[PDB]
Write a protein that binds this ligand. Structure first.
Ligand SMILES: C=C(C)[C@@H]1CCC(C)=C[C@H]1c1c(O)cc(CCCCC)cc1O
Ligand SMILES: [K+]
Ligand SMILES: [K+]
Lengths: 255, 255
C-alpha cells in the first residue's frame, strides 16, 4: 500500500534526522580541537624558522596532500620496490570491487583505468551475487538437514518445540559470529597492532559491505606475507556466504 | 548442483586474476611517476631552504598526513566556523551509512561515535533494505501493468509478444538510465566542475554502492547550495529505487 510505503519512508527520515543530530553532537568538538592543534602547530613551526616562507610552506603542504590523494606516502621515502599496485594488492582490490566493499584506500587514476573499473564492476557484480546466492543456498540446505536431525523430540526435555527451533537458530548464528567476527577481530588486532575496538570496527565495516577506508587490512607497509590479501579476501567471501545462508534460513522461517 | 557452483567459483577466480593483472599493468606508471616527483620536489625544497632539516621536513609531512587522517583540511588555515560535522553533512553521512554506500570522506573518530556508527548501521541497513524492496515491488508491479497495457495496445499483430516485451523493457531501461545518469552527470559537471568522465565515474560508483570516495558530491570546501547533501542523497535514493524495480521486473520475466 502507498500509505504504508510513505509511513516507512517517514520513519526512515526520522531515523536519519536523529542519527544526524547525535553524530553532529558527538563529533564537532574532536575536529574543532584538531583544527586548533594544526593551526597552532603551523604558527609555531613558522615562528621556528624565519627562513621558511609561509606561501612556500602552503605550496609544500598542497603538494603533500596531492601526493596523499594520489596514493603515495611522502613521509616515508619510497624505494619503488613495494609497489602499492602489487599483484596481490591488485587481486585484493579486484575482489573488493566485485564484492561491493570499496575501501577506496587505493583508487585508479588513469582515465582508461576508470573506464575499465566501471566495466569490470558492472560485469562482475551479478556473477559474484549469483555465486554468493548459490553457496548460501548450499549451506542453508546443509543447515536444514542438520535441523531435521535436531528435530527428534530428544535431548530437549520437551520444553517447547518453537523454543527449540529458535534456540537452534540462535546457537547457529552465535557460533558463526564467533567464528567469523570475534576471532578474525582478534587476529587482525594482533597482526596490525590496532585496538580491540578498532579491529572489531574494521571487521563489522568490511563484512557489512560498507568499506569506509579509515582502517584497511593492508597498510603502513609492515610486511604482510604468505598471500595476506588472497586469504583475507577468502575470509571475506566465506563470511559473506555464511551470512547469506543465515539470511536465507531466516527468510524461510519468516515465509 | 554444487559442481556447477564450483565451476562458477573457478570462473570468478580466473576473472579476478585477469582483472588484477590488467589493473597492475595500467596503474604502475602513475604511482612510479608520483613517487619520483615527490622525492625530487622534497629534495628541491631542501635545496631552497638549507635551514630545514630533512628529519624536521618529514616530521611536518607526518603531522600533515595525521591531520588528513583526522579529516581536517591542512592546506591554508581552517576556519573555526567551517564545521565538517554539521547538520547537512551528518544527514548525508547517515544516509550513506544506511544505504551501504560508504564514501569515506568523513568518519566518526570519537570512540563513542564509532560504537554508535556500528549500532546505527546494524539497525538502519535492514530498514532501508525493506523500504527499497517495497518501493521496488510497487514500481515493478505498476511497470508490469503498464508494459502489458502498451504491449496490448500498440503492437498486437504479426509479431512475437515476448520480443515486443523485451524491446519495450530495454527501451525503458535505456530511458531511465539516460534520465538518471546523463542528466545528473551534467548537473555535477556544472556544480562540481568535474570532467564528463569523472561525472559518469561518480554516478556509476554511487549507484553501484562501491563507494570509493575519490569523488564526493560535497567536498573541497568550494561552497554549495543550502542542504545540497540531503537532495543529492534523495537523488541516490530515487535512482536506486528505480533500478531495483527494473531488476525486479527483469527477474520476474526470467522466472
Ligand atoms: C545492484 C546491487 C549491487 C545491489 C542491489 C541494489 C542496490 C541499490 C544495492 C546493491 C546491494 C548490495 O550489493 C548488497 C546489499 C546487502 C548485502 C548484505 C550481505 C550480508 C544490498 C544491496 O541493496
Ligand atoms: K555496498
Ligand atoms: K564503500
Amino acid at each position: 500500500k502507498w500509505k504504508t510505503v510513505l509511513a516507512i519512508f517517514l520513519l526512515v527520515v526520522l531515523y536519519l534526522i536523529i542519527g544526524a543530530t547525535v553524530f553532529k553532537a558527538l563529533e564537532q568538538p574532536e575536529e574543532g580541537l584538531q583544527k586548533y592543534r594544526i593551526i597552532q602547530e603551523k604558527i609555531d613551526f613558522l615562528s621556528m624558522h624565519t627562513c621558511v616562507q609561509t606561501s612556500e610552506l602552503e605550496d609544500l603542504v598542497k603538494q603533500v596532500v596531492l601526493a596523499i590523494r594520489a596514493g603515495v606516502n611522502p613521509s616515508g621515502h619510497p624505494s619503488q620496490e613495494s609497489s602499492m599496485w602489487d599483484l596481490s594488492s591488485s587481486f585484493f582490490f579486484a575482489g573488493t570491487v566485485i564484492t561491493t566493499i570499496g575501501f577506496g584506500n587505493v583508487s585508479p587514476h588513469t582515465e582508461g583505468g576508470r573506464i575499465f573499473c566501471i566495466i569490470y564492476a558492472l560485469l562482475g557484480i551479478p556473477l559474484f551475487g549469483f555465486l554468493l546466492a548459490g553457496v548460501g543456498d548450499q549451506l542453508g540446505t546443509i543447515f536444514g538437514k542438520g535441523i531435521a536431525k535436531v528435530e527428534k523430540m530428544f535431548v530437549k526435555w520437551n520444553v517447547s518445540q518453537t523454543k527449540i527451533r529458535v534456540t537452534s537458530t540462535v546457537l547457529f548464528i552465535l557460533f558463526g559470529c564467533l567464528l567469523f567476527v570475534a576471532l578474525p577481530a582478534l587476529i587482525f588486532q594482533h597482526i596490525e597492532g590496532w585496538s580491540a575496538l578498532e579491529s572489531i570496527y574494521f571487521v563489522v565495516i568490511t563484512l557489512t559491505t560498507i568499506g569506509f577506508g579509515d582502517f584497511v587490512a593492508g597498510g603502513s607497509e609492515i610486511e604482510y606475507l604468505d598471500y595476506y590479501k588472497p586469504i583475507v579476501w577468502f575470509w571475506i567471501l566465506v563470511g559473506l556466504a555464511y551470512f547469506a545462508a543465515v539470511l536465507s534460513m531466516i527468510g524461510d522461517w519468516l515465509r
